[PDB]
């Protein structure tokens, strides 16, 4: 734990990147989190929503 301050900064940055990438997997109330699935399953009037 001598070098904790630098490891803390590295961990925080990596965790922020991991969270930002992970947020793509959430659908946010939509039917799916994948854009291709929505575009291939629905017509553009509801796919727009």
């Amino acid at each position: 734990s001598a070098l904790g301050k630098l490891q803390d900064v590295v961990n925080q940055n990596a965790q922020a990147l991991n969270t930002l990438v992970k947020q793509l997997s959430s659908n946010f109330g939509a039917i799916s989190s994948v854009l291709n699935d929505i575009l291939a399953r629905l017509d553009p009037p509801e796919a727009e929503v």
């Binding site: 017509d43 553009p44 009037p45 509801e46 727009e48």
Partner: protein
């Protein structure tokens, strides 16, 4: 835009509708502005034969 259609097809003259005349006869855009007017014309646009 003036035309004559069926009684059940008047719902398809709207933005974002799925239908037969919507796809192959008359298509409205998703961002369409204006008014659709429909009235019965059985007395004039119909014949017994």
């Amino acid at each position: 835009d003036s035309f004559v259609i069926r009684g059940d097809e008047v719902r398809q003259i709207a933005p974002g509708q799925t239908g037969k005349i919507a796809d192959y006869n008359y298509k409205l855009p998703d961002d369409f502005t204006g008014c659709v007017i429909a009235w019965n014309s059985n007395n004039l646009d119909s014949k017994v034969g």
